[PDB]
């Protein structure tokens with residue numbers, strides 16, 4: 001028991017890293033313009049929930065710890081610490097889960113030429129996240145004042161409250177989160193195979209068109225280039241600020257190939273010289289922007305997979321032991337599994353710390369903001 005005084009300190013480390021880790025994330029997304037992605041707009045709100053969870057309900061989880069788990073505050077405010085903790089936590093899965101199916105639908109749909117709002121779509125999307133988040137949390141204060149106390153410690157004790165609340169707030173979202181996620185990674189991976197194929201196709205026939213000695217050999221070789229070029233025009237990862245240029249440079253590049261074709265049938269010696277995408281800056285940019293754009297979404301999917309994965313890995317101990325309380329009400333000792341719950345809620349409460357760490361470990365631009373922000377300099 002000499003080493004059990006460390007829990008206070010170790011848990012305070014989990015309280016510190018979450019309040020600081022997500023304070024920067026709120027800062028760094030707002031200040032540095034290079035991180036204004038729609039998916040970085042979600043991350044800025046999520047990180048607020050983790051800031052609000054660290055700032056409100058993780059500490060009194062420790063305050064209770066010090067007292068021996070006998071609830072140390074007024075009787076009357078227990079449903080509000082359960083409510084708050086339920087609400088912010090339930091907003092962190094909703095933020096994660098929204099992100100995954102927001103990115104999922106966009107990859108399996110086209111541009112769709114909507115852009116009704118000017119990247120307030122994030123702002124609309126996030127307020128829907130919280131009202132669904134606070135949709136679910138009204139039942140705790142609705143039956144706020146019993147079903148919230150057990151032997152002088154404060155836990156959700158209504159069996160259906162803690163049974164329904166697992167599927168509605170944890171397993172449905174975690175499953176939804178993961179099911180969409182994997183479909184997308186398989187989808188993105190299977191769309192990079194199309195752009196690379198379309199540029200390889202385009203370059204090989206370009207060499208063929210130049211090196212072909214027959215008169216109409218160009219025809220098959222430069223009609224195919226038109227074919228791939230359109231497919232590329234139809235392909236971009238989810239990511240009108242740079243969408244004209246892609247379309248214009250698609251159109252602008254197509255002109256060069258199109259024109260050579262137009263005068264290819266007419267003819268001959270000159271059209272080989274006419275299809276010279278090798279000599280023009282336009283074509284070189286487009287291969288660049290796509291391969292840089294393809295690779296960026298690779299790393300976003302991986303960084304997101306890390307936060308997705310270790311969110312549900314970390315809270316599953318607390319939810320499996322808790323759902324097992326009600327399923328195993330009679331068979332198994334409740335003083336052991338109640339002990340596991342004192343612990344497995346800090347495996348879970350520690351995810352609020354983790355995701356700022358994984359941002360620095362894999363996003364160069366998130367790293368530089370934090371490092372400066374520690375030094376105070378914008």
Ligand SMILES: CC(C)CCC[C@@H](C)[C@H]1CC[C@H]2[C@@H]3CC=C4C[C@@H](O)CC[C@]4(C)[C@H]3CC[C@]12C
Nearest residue numbers: 015016019020023024027372373374375376377
């Ligand atoms: C109770 C004691 C130990 C402090 C608890 C941790 C928090 C509240 C402390 C510790 C380190 C502090 C931060 C140090 C660095 C920055 C970045 C700066 O650009 C804005 C202020 C800010 C964000 C400070 C605000 C408060 C802070 C986050």
Ligand SMILES: CSc1ccc2c(c1)[C@@H](N1CCN(C)CC1)Cc1ccccc1S2
Nearest residue numbers: 082085086089090156162165166169315345
């Ligand atoms: C009791 S059954 C249940 C159902 C829903 C939710 C919780 C618990 C919540 N706990 C946290 C501990 N706190 C002492 C009580 C409330 C935990 C959590 C974790 C992750 C996302 C959402 C939620 S909301």
Ligand SMILES: CCCCCCCC/C=C/CCCCCCCC(=O)O
Nearest residue numbers: 313316317320321324332333336337
């Ligand atoms: C996705 C990763 C999943 C990891 C699962 C870890 C499981 C943690 C605990 C499981 C429930 C244990 C409950 C122990 C109660 C013992 C019952 C008794 O005393 O009779």
